[PDB]
Design a protein around this nucleic acid. Structure first.
Ligand SMILES: *O[C@H]1[C@@H](O)[C@H](n2cnc3c(N)ncnc32)O[C@@H]1COP(=O)(O)OP(=O)(O)OP(=O)(O)OC[C@H]1O[C@@H](n2c[n+](C)c3c(=O)[nH]c(N)nc32)[C@H](O)[C@@H]1O
Ligand SMILES: [Mg+2]
Ligand SMILES: [Mg+2]
Lengths: 731, 485, 726
RNA sequence: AUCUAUAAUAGCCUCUC
RNA sequence: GACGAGGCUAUU
RNA sequence: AGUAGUAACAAG
């Protein structure tokens, strides 16, 4: 209706106010005058709505034939005013009851995302509900699944292309990847009568992602975030199997997490291989057995290969670094924490892989062989492919090698922590930074004469073969057909050895990083809780101790060492770092033995220390146990047990005889002797030490752990059990 | 520079740390104990524990508030036809003759065959609603010239002492009755096991709350505020009789329409959110106002008849009071059901904790116990200076009553008291955990607490309860001071 | 008998675990009544009391009385003090710079880039803003438009360039004009018998002098705040004009950039992100405690935070932060603290004097406060006016050089607090302090060898804060052993506990419309289940309560119920006419089928397959008249997406002329949108006029229609003739 | 490995005596 | 007569 | 009167 618009503009230009507004207001200033409003917006819309619904005609009618279809009155109910026509809510009800019937094609199309949400809910299975501690971590996660996801700017450009191609402006190159998609969308909306802005927000709903910080526990995929409110609380878990289809990447990540957890649980057990097989055979990744998932997916990590070998499968030595697949050829690497100085000047803690390793590298179509050494990229033999893919593969290989030039090539701003202070994987951040600014990386790397061999030629930073090429990279004409195997036998300790006997993998190579699986992981075993986090394991172990408190105490008084061996304590041992497990065991065993033999028994301390007595004892060279003020456990700085005072994981109130474990309150009433209130805690805090009397000022200040450890037997010392309560002890 | 400036800064500039002890925590608001002050009077918008509802069997047909009131009054014709008043108590500035005339006009209008609840603007109605009481606005110049025009001295809320009726109301509102007032609508069927768990838990929780007197009082408040807002919007320039009504269900499933009294709405031209509409309330009761006259300074009470509940008949008095409300209060009264949530969410949390410790749903065990666990019990109150225990449901009802009172008696005094006393509660918790709390200006914190205890009955009773609980906590801590010592 | 004591719950449950019961948020929030002038005057008096021992002089630009407490004498007691020392602030900032190399430079560079790519329309994003042309409050967009038009009247066309920088240059230049011409609002009064006074506003030209314009630009409009919880007494808030708001943005952006990279700052992180950061920080401090020692946490609030902070210190902070920036950006960042150092407070509506015997009342405005003898004011007001007289301006305002009454430097005030937290030690003493800061709230973690050394460290931190103009509240602050504390009303007890009470007010009917309100309620329930520890039983009860509230609000009770009403008659008729009644919406009398598992599904989608075809067609009618239409495009939303005509009809005011200008703007914008369909979705860009853009677009459309056959010869000739005539 | 990227309006919550 | 900032939500 | 509470409404 171009002519109608021209006539409307001509008529509007007659008004002097309108003419001056049009002439003086810039296109930028339109955004100002669009919001012009002489009156303030009323506040408290809830009260305004409750008040207005009691009015007679609180609703505005759109003038037209359809408004005229509404009768003036209906059975003594006035629906519309007889300026701006207003109607009652009864008018809306009348329209819904007797109004014209319309075609609902638009609603079905505009809200397709919500219909997919409903279908995903409907084609879902519900498992059991379990009651128990659930440790949740706050992570930035995706709210709703999207088939294709792009950042908001790209999505806005694509939407402008689809819906408003004329007034779209510069053809940003970033839209290239999506050009085909645009055509497809322009196919579906060619003859739609829906208002364009609604279609634009439909497309945003389909393309733009919404990511929010939410508390999650073991299921971070958007299909699960949709049901998060029903998935779990703080004290219960609800097994859920969403409908639809799940990506292969999610399955691979979830199986990696499951295998790492299985290995961590199994290593501390006797015969770790048998326990690992037993757990793996009962592990389900969402709704599929772990063995089947390992058989299907072509990838994983060290833990996945170890679990494959334990199950009789074939190890796939594939690794993923974001954009490229790396298949091991030879060599074994070890990861070490080291403070590396980045080009920007800020020292960052990074895991550096030592040793010499060979990898079949694949990126898109480009293939190659990468020879890497500690902190140095030795060589990279590549085949001719797309120049763009070739350079992405080259930079990915250089960053993957952790070369000194790569680190020194950083010039700008790199964030290794998110706004919440959570640690982002440094190597992926470096990869992302160098992906879009490869110019500085190539400039820093250096160049050298291109090889003059018959089949070897170099490549320069100009993405073309030339007489100059960056150090290390060599092109070859020897076509390679990608990766398309080794045979190993898994030993008792979950170490993979070839026919020659050399260890190629082991349980000590498994990453210790605790991560949230994208897909819900289930263990169809009564001891599933043993695969939980540190806090869940601690709470479950202490609850088990409390449940069997009477029998445990009886066995302790009668028995000597058979009480220290239990499967619950075996699971507890997996969250103790292996370095301190023996020392903690020796300390706790000595403390409990002295509590028993000397007849000064404290139930709270006995319960606190019993789980730590599982590992084989590890005393000092002189035959005495190590002394500790707190026993540290894996993960977080708040995961520790205080020997003397209370701890975030364990505290005891003698007044109410209440034990607080990981925030849960339990009662020791009945399972307690009131005489234990008069009993001294100083007899249950140091191995080989017994309270000798009141705090003597002669001895001086309170001694420390190392000072206590060097005391001769039969020697006194002043000890501060906790604030406002000193005591003196003797050996 | 910082070191140099701190060197020359006076030692008087100090945070003055002081280690907190149980003996340093004194009772809050001692003035609530001195008998010089008057005991805090009853000021709630409606009777709660003294309410008396005339019950009429219904057929599930919510005809109309006017028809419901007319039928209820027809059932109790003796009360309806009582024409000669016997004054029992009189408010200081009330005209009992005008109030009785207004009550009779309300009864006649409700009982007439006409379908309208409008009242004429008569002399007694105009006095009761406060007609023509707004000051005339004059020009600035004349006012400045006029030397008699002065800024009014603000009226401050007065200071009152503890009144036993607040404790009585707390005791009676949290007791179980035989009537259900909650009208919770249906939800969708349960499919997921978590939904079935939620339904099973809702059974216990709602059955506990739905039968307590506080639920009926809350429903009366909600329904009356809804009706009042609708009438205020619909009838701005008319006096309307608004029956105070409820619908209850017996344990046998039979429903009753309950009429607790009648209200007269004055002119409602509420432009602002704080603008006041006057409401004159006439509420039936069985309580004799003379038993504790200090509770009813604001009420003009007539004795209008008698009723039979057992072999002993009970008197029926009419409590008449001029009151006011605004749109904010009417809106927040329509949504008082949220009290439920605040009571439920807390108690449910406790149950969940127990579940995590036992590995199975603990709702039934908490409420009534089971084979392996005894019912969970809470310190609920005092009886002759000794701590008394109560069931999980009793504690739930107490928390629900507390939230309902937060709504009923909530104002700025309650808000400030809650914040400052929360600070004090955190300090007390630190003491209980043996965390060795330290303070800097404890008297300042106490003064901040006590600045808010003037005339809010709930705040005064809360200060009394806080002092009692603090004494019990000191007694309990006396045993915790001799461990390994 | 037996007496119920609710506090006895705390005997069984720790305070933090039952903290929600200490928040009485089912009650009506306190509201303010009448004038806020008393609170504003109290604020002015206290702000000057905390700085009276500083340098007092007279401004040579405005003639106002100025108080400068910076570099003043050190305090000799524990009363609130605004005498911050520039040397100490600079030392703290240098320590921050040393501990975070390149942080100041990166933040300044990012802020400069954002400013260079920021347009003038960023200022429309505010709420009620002080308009100097009318000396009133107007919506931010309206105030910005009025300022732009007035500047156009005074040969100030920087806003045409589009960027915020040229417009701010225009503001700076406007401060130098010897005179100012603008458009203001004048009311005509008519006598309508009832007699009542009817007001008719209209636009009229006006002129003011340089000093008057400068004072208006530096003016703050003060009002009262309502619906505030947890406070016995009401307070006054303030709003600035366009001139100040233009420059506040860059300083806020710079401070935000700094704060995001400070591990000790609780801003701008909020919600679950803030909880994660705080938990991580607490765990780090717990693990960092030296062995055998003591760690003690101070829960603290700062008293008189805004009163005692000085804009001069903020100017110093800005100058220090932008050390390595170009001179233009340093000047730009210094503008806002300068404007705040010379700010003027408008004192509000005034007071009311009455005659009780004569039943009369009258409002004395601020310019006439001292026109009546002080004996005719009440005691408190008389004392406050006597104290205010020295700082009072004859036109009804007060000079307010000290303090931060606006409260627009939350991020910069957080940076200063964190800089205080970054000292960590005084005199090599045997303690170390760290902590978390969020404006005036802080948590201070002190590690030492015993309690006494921790107390010494706390005292040192208190005195150090005194040196920076920060006053730790000794009445509302306390300390205990690390493991339990409170920060920004979040209660940590071996972890952050859920506080369900603060979410209660959000569980009602939102007040947008029926469908949107249903969606909002269900989403609120779902998110409270996820975040605030709401169990499934409480969630289902919340569903039921929201359904009840919704039915009573929208008078859409169940179709098989017997409730009466205008809507209910038709609801019952629809219920009788309907076969698949489970498909009816709650607003149409249908049943509620929401449960926990489907809280995230919209109601129409949830019941879509259950609807009868006729009801579905009527409900989802593309051309239903209850929703707006673009002009006839199809609207996919149902008939329940209606809108209420929010006519702010102020009594006895007839806007026969303001509505005219609003309608003119609306017509121009509607025509422009008809010419440019993407304008609503994407902000149009261009320094050319709207008329030229529309003319060229219509010319192109006509020519392309002619070439494509859409338009014939005669229509093309008409269109070209009209375009040429235009 | 979500780091990036992110138009407008409105609502709720948090942050002087 | 109802401001600033942060988070979250809904809508176009 | 009353609501209420440091200032307002009790129509304009
Ligand atoms: O998201 C985490 C993890 O699940 C995911 N990941 C790792 N491997 C896969 C596969 N194969 N498929 C899908 N997703 C995968 O990436 C994150 C890994 O976290 P984390 O386990 O902590 O990493 P790791 O400790 O293994 O070291 P990192 O540098 O982050 O590299 C992880 C990945 O890259 C391999 N790798 C890199 N470099 C430089 C290596 C090397 O020099 N030598 C060896 N042997 N491996 C190297 C890691 O081994 C992993 O394969
Ligand atoms: Mg604080
Ligand atoms: Mg604070």
């Amino acid at each position: 209706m171009t002519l109608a618009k021209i006539e409307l503009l001509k008529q509007l230009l007659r008004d002097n106010e309108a003419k001056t507004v049009l002439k003086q207001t810039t296109v930028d200033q339109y955004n100002i005058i669009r919001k012009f409003n002489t009156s303030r917006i009323e506040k408290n819309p809830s009260l305004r709505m409750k008040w207005a619904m009691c009015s007679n005609f609180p609703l505005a009618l759109t003038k037209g034939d359809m408004a005229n279809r509404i009768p003036l009155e209906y059975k003594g109910i006035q629906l519309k005013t007889n300026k701006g026509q207003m109607c009652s809510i009864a008018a809306v009800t009348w329209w819904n009851t007797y109004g014209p019937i319309g075609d609902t094609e638009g609603f079905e199309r505009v809200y397709e995302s919500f219909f997919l949400r409903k279908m995903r809910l409907d084609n879902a299975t519900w498992g059991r509900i379990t009651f128990g501690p659930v440790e949740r971590v706050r992570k930035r996660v995706l709210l709703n699944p999207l088939t294709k996801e792009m950042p908001p700017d790209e999505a806005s450009n694509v939407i402008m292309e689809i819906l408003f191609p004329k007034e779209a402006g510069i053809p940003r190159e970033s839209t290239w990847i999506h050009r085909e998609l645009i055509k497809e969308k322009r196919e579906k909306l060619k003859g739609t009568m829906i208002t364009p802005i609604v279609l634009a927000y439909m497309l945003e709903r389909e393309l733009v992602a919404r990511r929010r910080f939410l508390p999650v526990a073991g299921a971070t995929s958007a299909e699960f975030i949709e049901m998060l409110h029903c998935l779990q609380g703080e004290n219960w878990r609800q097994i859920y199997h969403p409908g639809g289809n799940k990506l292969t990447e999610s399955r691979s990540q979830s199986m990696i997490v499951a295998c790492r957890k299985i290995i961590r649980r199994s290593i501390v057990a006797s015969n770790p291989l048998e326990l690992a097989v037993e757990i793996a055979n009962k592990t389900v990744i969402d709704t599929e057995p772990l063995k089947s998932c390992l058989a299907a997916i072509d990838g994983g990590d060290v833990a996945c290969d170890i679990i494959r070998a334990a199950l009789g499968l074939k190890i796939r030595q594939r690794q993923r670094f974001g954009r490229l697949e790396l298949k091991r050829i030879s060599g074994r690497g070890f990861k070490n924490d080291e403070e590396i100085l980045i080009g920007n000047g800020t020292i960052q803690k990074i895991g550096i892989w030592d040793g010499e390793e060979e990898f079949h590298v694949r990126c898109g179509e480009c293939r190659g062989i990468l020879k890497k050494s500690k902190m140095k990229l030795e060589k990279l033999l590549i085949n001719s492919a797309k120049k763009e893919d070739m350079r992405d593969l080259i930079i990915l290989c250089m960053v993957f090698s952790q070369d000194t030039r790569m680190f020194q090539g950083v010039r700008g701003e790199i964030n290794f922590l998110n706004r919440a202070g959570q640690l982002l994987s440094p190597m992926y951040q470096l990869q992302r930074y160098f992906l879009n600014r490869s110019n500085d990386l190539f400039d820093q790397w250096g160049y050298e004469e291109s090889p003059k061999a018959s089949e070897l030629h170099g490549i320069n930073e100009s993405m073309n073969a030339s007489d100059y090429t960056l150090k290390g990279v060599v092109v070859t004409r020897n076509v390679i057909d990608d990766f398309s195997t080794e045979k190993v036998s898994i030993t008792k300790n979950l170490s993979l050895i070839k026919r020659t006997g050399e260890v190629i993998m082991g349980a000590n190579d498994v990453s210790e990083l605790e991560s949230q699986a994208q897909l819900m992981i289930t263990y169809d075993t009564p001891k599933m809780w043993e695969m939980g986090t540190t806090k869940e394991l601690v709470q479950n172990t202490y609850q088990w101790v409390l449940k069997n408190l009477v029998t445990l105490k009886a066995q302790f008084l009668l028995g000597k060492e058979d009480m220290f061996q239990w499967d619950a304590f075996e699971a507890f041992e997996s969250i103790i770092p292996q370095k301190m497990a023996g020392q903690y065991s020796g300390f706790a065993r000595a403390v409990l033995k002295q509590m028993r033999d000397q007849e000064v028994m404290k139930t709270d301390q006995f319960i606190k220390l019993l789980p730590f007595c599982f590992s084989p004892p590890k005393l000092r060279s002189n035959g005495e146990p190590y002394q500790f003020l707190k026993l540290v456990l894996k993960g977080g700085g708040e995961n520790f047990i205080e020997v003397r005072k209370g701890s975030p994981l364990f505290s005891y109130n003698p007044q109410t005889e209440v034990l607080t474990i990981c925030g849960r309150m339990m009662s020791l009433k009945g399972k307690i002797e009131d005489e234990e209130r008069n009993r001294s805690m100083g007899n249950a805090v140091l191995a080989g030490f017994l309270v000798s009397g009141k705090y003597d000022p002669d001895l001086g200040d309170f001694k420390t752990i190392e000072e206590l450890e060097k005391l001769k037997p039969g020697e006194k010392a002043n000890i501060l059990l906790y604030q406002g309560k000193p005591v003196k002890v003797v050996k | 520079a910082i070191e140099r400036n701190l060197a020359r800064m006076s030692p008087l500039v100090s945070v003055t740390p002081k280690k907190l002890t149980w003996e340093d925590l004194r009772p809050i608001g001692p003035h609530i104990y001195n008998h010089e002050l008057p005991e805090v009077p009853y000021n709630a918008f409606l009777l709660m524990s003294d309410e008396l509802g005339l019950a009429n069997m219904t057929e599930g047909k919510s005809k109309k508030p006017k028809t419901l009131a007319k039928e209820c009054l027809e059932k109790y014709s003796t009360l309806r036809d009582q024409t000669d008043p016997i004054l029992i108590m009189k408010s200081e500035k009330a005209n009992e003759n005008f109030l009785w005339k207004l009550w009779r006009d309300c009864v006649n209008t409700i009982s007439n065959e006409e379908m309208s609840n409008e009242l004429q603007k008569t002399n007694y109605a105009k006095w009761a609603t406060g007609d023509g009481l707004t000051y005339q606005k004059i020009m600035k110049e004349v006012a400045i010239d006029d030397e008699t025009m002065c800024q009014e001295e603000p009226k401050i809320p007065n200071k009152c002492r503890v009144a036993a009726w607040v404790q009585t109301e707390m005791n009676l509102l949290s007791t179980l009755t035989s009537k259900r007032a909650l009208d919770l609508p249906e939800i969708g069927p349960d499919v997921a096991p978590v939904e079935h768990v939620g339904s099973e838990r809702r059974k216990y929780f709602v059955n506990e709350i739905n039968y307590c007197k506080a639920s009926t009082v809350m429903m009366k408040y909600v329904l009356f505020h809804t009706s009042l807002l609708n009438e205020s919007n619909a009838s701005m320039g008319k006096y309307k009789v608004i029956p105070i009504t409820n619908r209850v269900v017996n344990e046998k499933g039979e429903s009753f329409d309950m009429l607790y009294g009648l209200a007269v709405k004055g002119q409602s031209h509420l432009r602002g959110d704080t603008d006041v509409v006057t409401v004159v309330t006439f509420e039936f009761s069985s309580t004799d106002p003379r038993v504790d006259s200090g509770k009813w300074p604001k009420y003009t009470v007539f004795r209008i008849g008698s009723l039979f509940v057992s072999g002993r008949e009970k008197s029926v008095y009419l409590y008449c009071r001029v009151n006011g409300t605004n749109k904010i209060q009417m809106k927040w009264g329509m949504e008082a059901r949220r009290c439920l949530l605040q009571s439920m969410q807390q108690m449910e949390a406790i149950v969940e904790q127990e579940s995590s410790i036992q590995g199975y749903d603990m709702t039934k065990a908490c409420f009534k116990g089971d084979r392996v666990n005894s019912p969970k019990t809470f310190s609920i109150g005092t009886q002759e200076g000794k701590l008394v225990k109560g069931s999980f449901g009793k504690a739930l009802r107490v928390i629900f009553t507390k939230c309902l009172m937060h709504y009923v008696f909530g104002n700025a005094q309650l808000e400030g008291f809650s914040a400052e006393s929360r600070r004090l509660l955190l300090l007390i918790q630190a003491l209980k955990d043996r965390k060795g709390p330290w303070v800097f200006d404890l008297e300042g914190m106490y003064s901040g607490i006590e600045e808010c205890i003037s005339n809010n009955p709930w705040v005064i009773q809360s200060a009394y309860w806080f002092n009692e609980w603090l004494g019990f906590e000191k007694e309990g801590s006396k045993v915790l001071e001799s461990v390994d010592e | 008998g037996m007496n119920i004591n609710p506090y006895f719950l705390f005997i069984d449950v720790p305070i933090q675990a039952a903290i929600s019961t200490t928040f009485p948020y089912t009650g009506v929030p306190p509201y303010s009544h009448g004038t806020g002038t008393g609170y504003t005057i109290d604020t002015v008096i206290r702000t000057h009391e905390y700085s009276n021992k500083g340098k007092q002089y007279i401004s040579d630009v405005t003639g106002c009385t100025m108080v400068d407490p910076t570099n003043g004498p050190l305090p000799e007691d524990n009363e609130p003090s605004a005498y911050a020392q520039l040397d100490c602030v600079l030392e703290a900032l240098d320590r921050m710079d040393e501990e975070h190399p390149g942080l100041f430079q990166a933040a300044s560079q990012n802020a400069m880039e954002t400013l260079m790519v920021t347009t003038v329309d960023k200022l429309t994003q505010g709420r009620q803003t002080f308009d100097w042309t009318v000396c009133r409050n107007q919506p931010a967009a309206t105030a910005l438009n009025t300022t732009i038009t007035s500047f156009r009247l005074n040969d100030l066309n920087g806003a045409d360039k589009g960027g915020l920088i040229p417009f701010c240059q225009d503001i700076i230049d406007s401060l130098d004009r010897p005179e100012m011409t603008f458009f203001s609002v004048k009311n005509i009064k008519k006598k309508l018998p009832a007699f009542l006074i009817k007001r008719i506003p209209m636009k009229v030209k006006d002129k003011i002098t340089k000093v008057e314009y400068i004072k208006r630009a530096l003016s703050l409009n003060t009002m009262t705040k309502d619906a505030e919880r947890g406070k016995l007494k009401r307070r006054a808030i303030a709003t600035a004009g366009i001139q100040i708001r233009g420059f506040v943005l860059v300083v806020e952006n710079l401070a935000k950039n700094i704060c995001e990279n400070l591990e000790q700052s609780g801003l701008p992180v909020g919600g679950n992100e803030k909880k994660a950061k705080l938990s991580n920080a607490v765990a780090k401090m717990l693990s960092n405690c030296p062995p055998g020692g003591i760690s003690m946490t101070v829960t603290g609030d700062n008293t008189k935070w805004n009163e005692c902070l000085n804009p001069r210190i903020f100017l110093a902070m800005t100058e220090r932060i932008t050390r390595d920036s170009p001179i233009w950006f340093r000047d730009f960042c210094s503008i806002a603290p300068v404007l705040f150092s010379n700010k003027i407070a408008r004192l509000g509506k005034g007071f009311m004097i009455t005659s009780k015997t004569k039943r009369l009342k009258a409002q004395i405005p601020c310019p006439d406060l001292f026109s009546i003898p002080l004996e005719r004011y009440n005691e408190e007001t008389r004392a406050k006016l006597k104290k205010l007289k020295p700082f009072f301006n004859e036109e009804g305002t007060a000079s307010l050089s000290p303090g931060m009454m606006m409260g627009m430097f939350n991020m910069l005030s957080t940076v200063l607090g964190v800089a205080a937290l970054g000292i960590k030690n005084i005199g090599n003493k045997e303690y170390l302090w760290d902590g978390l800061q969020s404006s005036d709230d802080f948590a201070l973690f002190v590690n030492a060898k015993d309690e006494e050394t921790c107390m010494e460290g706390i005292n040192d931190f208190y005195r150090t804060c005194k040196l920076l103009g920060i006053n730790m509240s000794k009445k509302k602050s306390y300390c205990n052993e690390t493991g339990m504390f409170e920060f920004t009303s979040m209660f940590y007890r071996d972890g952050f506990v859920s506080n369900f009470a603060m979410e209660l007010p959000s569980f009602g009917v939102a007040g947008v419309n029926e469908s949107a309100d249903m969606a909002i309620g269900m989403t609120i329930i779902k998110n409270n289940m996820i975040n605030n520890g709401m169990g499934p039983a409480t969630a289902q009860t919340a569903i039921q309560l929201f359904i009840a509230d919704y039915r009573y609000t929208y008078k859409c009770h169940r179709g098989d119920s017997k409730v009466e009403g205008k809507r209910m008659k038709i609801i019952k008729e629809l219920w009788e006419n309907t076969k698949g009644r489970d498909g009816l919406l709650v607003a149409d009398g249908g049943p509620n089928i929401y449960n926990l598992r489907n809280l995230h599904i919209p109601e129409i989608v949830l019941k879509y397959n259950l609807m009868d075809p006729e009801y579905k067609g009527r409900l989802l009618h593309p051309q239903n008249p209850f929703v707006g239409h673009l002009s006839d495009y199809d609207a996919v939303s149902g008939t329940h997406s209606w809108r209420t005509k929010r006519n702010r009809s102020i009594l006895n005011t007839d806007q026969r002329n303001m509505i005219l200008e609003e309608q003119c703007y609306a017509k121009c914008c509607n025509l422009f949108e008809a010419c440019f369909n993407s304008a609503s979705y994407r902000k149009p860009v261009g320094q050319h006029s709207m008329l030229e853009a529309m003319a060229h677009r219509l010319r192109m459309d006509a020519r392309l229609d002619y070439e494509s056959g859409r338009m014939s010869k005669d229509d093309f000739e008409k269109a070209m003739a009209h375009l040429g005539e235009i």
